[PDB]
């Protein structure tokens with residue numbers, strides 16, 4: 035049933051010409067099979083025999099390697115921000131999921147591009163007439179076709195809601211199971227007048243409809259845990275499709291990216307060849323599994339009840355949040371591990387988590403949720419005022435949860451009277467990567483320290499550290515370095531930098547600190563002194 | 571009419587920008603705005619096979635706003651058909667400039683067919699429950715660089731009468747705007763605008779720079795001097811004559827920061843002498859028409875902000891301070907935005923170009939709210955950054 039829809043005009047990437055690849059001769063058996071097969075696609079109209087003139091060719095195997103053709107195909111414009119989240123679905127009275135079958139083979143390929151789709155049978159020579167299976171266009175062209183076709187039936191049935199996602203048509207409508215049945219009939223026939231045949235093996239009873247792998251019960255959508263095999267013959271394409279499953283779940287299941295397995299795909303070869311990988315490969319699947327094991331689910335959406343996001347600092351650099359509408363009936367829960375900076379703050383990370391969640395909703399629900407955050411209104415207010423950059427949170431609202439967020443410490447706006455003033459400085463020879471770090475003081479103390487394999491930044495920090503250690507609860511300290519000044523000025527909660535962490539531990543312990551800065555090399559008092567002490 | 575052929579800059583392809591998520595509201599808004607333009611035939615639905623895309627959004631003074639910044643960077647410069655011919659220079663000086671939205675004119679002139687693909691834009695769908703609606707302009711689009719220059723002549727013929735009719739009212743066209751400046755009294759100004767307005771229907775002189783000044787002290791502690799010293803050090807990069815030395819001399823020791831210190835004639839001479847030069851023009855300032863303008867904004871906490879426009883570092887073409895006292899309307903984002911918008915209009919009226927901004931904010935943040943406050947027909951280029959101690963260095 036090849037659809038009568040107009041064809042989307044496809045081009046090759048400018049500067050390129052269609053593929054030309056040799057077919058590795060297959061086994062007598064394989065060949066006799068591919069023919070057997072090709073002959074009926076030829077019968078169904080899906081493909082067709084062609085003369086040995088057509089320069090181009092792409093490999094068939096018997097278990098089409100479209101890699102090349104795709105590498106030279108006009109990259110299209112995928113028209114979707116992402117896959118739809120089940121929580122985004124509103125609750126409907128009547129719902130059916132028509133799996134449009136064979137949908138690719140039904141939708142015809144542009145004539146003037148068909149040339150490129152030729153393939154031979156070790157030979158017999160064919161060329162497609164319809165969206166090929168592996169071809170790059172297929173999905174994007176199929177979606178465009180599917181929509182042009184639904185449009186008509188849609189202007190006609192505003193009550194009905196059709197969501198497409200590949201070969202699956204979620205048709206929902208708040209209707210009498212009777213009248214719905216009828217609409218589904220009608221619809222089912224429209225498709226037919228367009229060659230789109232919808233098999234009888236559909237959804238006809240079961241409340242757990244599987245639209246996109248989301249079991250759609252009337253009040254609870256769920257996702258059956260994704261099984262992820264590990265066969266003997268771990269074939270290339272298998273490795274690719276494997277990626278798919280993972281990647282698909284990923285928009286629910288938190289982090290799974292088999293990125294290092296993906297590296298195995300960064301050195302492609304025959305699609306039929308088997309090719310494993312080290313601990314990278316082996317271990318990646320496992321960590322993925324762990325996550326894939328525990329199922330997920332949530333309620334549907336109400337376009338009349340508020341969205342509420344609630345985040346909680348469930349640990350160092352990992353946060354959690356849930357977006358719900360009804361106390362124990364949440365849509366999406368989520369974890370958010372991140373630390374955007376080498377030195378961040380909980381206040382700072384909270385904000386990041388907020389903004390993630392904000393858009394994430396705007397994508398799914400279409401509006402920004404209202405928050406319940408582990409941070410006191412005055413703690414925020416002080417922090418933004420004490421920060422050089424501009425910031426902002428939306429529907430902020432305090433919720434006294436157990437782990438709370440606070441600015442662990444703060445520096446003094448003005449120098450402490452009666453605090454031993456530490457003049458600090460460090461240095462290191464670029465060549466040797468060795469340096470000293472020390473100080474001098476208004477009293478008389480004067481430390482200096484030998485150092486191995488560091489940078490001048492590291493010394494300038496070591497030096498602040500020392501003066502912090504060798505001092506009391508209140509201390510004025512002074513650097514010839516904006517680097518260290520900056521890190522500290524930013525009130526870093528934690529860091530990748532141990533020394534910075536060290537420097538922080540002290541900072542939370544002291545009682546009053548005032549870090550100041552002076553122009554290096556000017557005869558600024560005390561400075562010229564520590565300057566000489568660290569020089570060799 | 572026969573379309574003016576325009577083409578992308580050498581060896582650059584059209585734009586291919588992803589669309590930002592839109593609120594179930596701005597979307598709806600757009601959706602109707604487009605369905606009409608479609609009916610009027612100014613746009614037209616296109617397919618997935620047009621690999622290009624520019625983002626759109628709903629500003630609201632609803633208005634469709636296409637973020638053409640890319641297609642503009644990729645558009646051939648205009649210089650044959652001299653885009654907005656010489657910059658007035660008069661504008662800078664007039665008693666009153668007023669800006670008009672000549673933009674809707676553009677929707678008449680037909681756009682070169684072999685160029686339409688490059689304006690493709692896509693209206694997003696909630697939860698991605700629907701393929702986006704994609705379109706392609708069929709007329710000079712609103713924010714395109716190509717538009718105005720192409721329509722340059724039509725406009726010129728249109729104003730010529732009224733211009734020769736009032737030989738001294740400067741009219742500068744920039745993008746979709748018309749900066750009509752005059753020195754007439756406010757009332758007698760407005761008439762001229764209205765006269766100019768029928769035709770189409772067919773206060774810089776107060777701007778002021780920032781004089782850097784050192785504090786007024788007596789309670790000079792050690793760091794009070796250390797402070798001064800540090801600044802005057804950096805200030806030299808701007809005024810090579812300023813020099814701290816007699817000041818550093820006061821500091822010589824290992825004095826506790828709190829120690830008070832006697833400002834001797836050594837320094838008394840230097841401060842006063844320096845105070846002079848901080849108000850004397852850096853003769854090196856030059857606005858070079860071939861260099862970009864850069865704007866830097868610092869946050870000053872009191873709902874105040876500081877900015878400097880410069881082409882080459884330390885050669886400030888202008889410096890300033892916006893203080894948007896928002897007792898309740900304190901959305902830094904909203905402020906910073908308003909800052910941004912007020913600084914680019916100043917530059918359009920002066921250098922005749924929108925500076926490229928270095929925003930003191932996180933991309934993410936700036937990216938999630940900016941549109942909520944943006945009110946302009948245009949959108950300057952911007953780069954996110956982290957301001958160092960300049961806050962102090964000039965406030």
Ligand SMILES: [Mg+2]
Nearest residue numbers: 459514515554
């Ligand atoms: Mg140093």
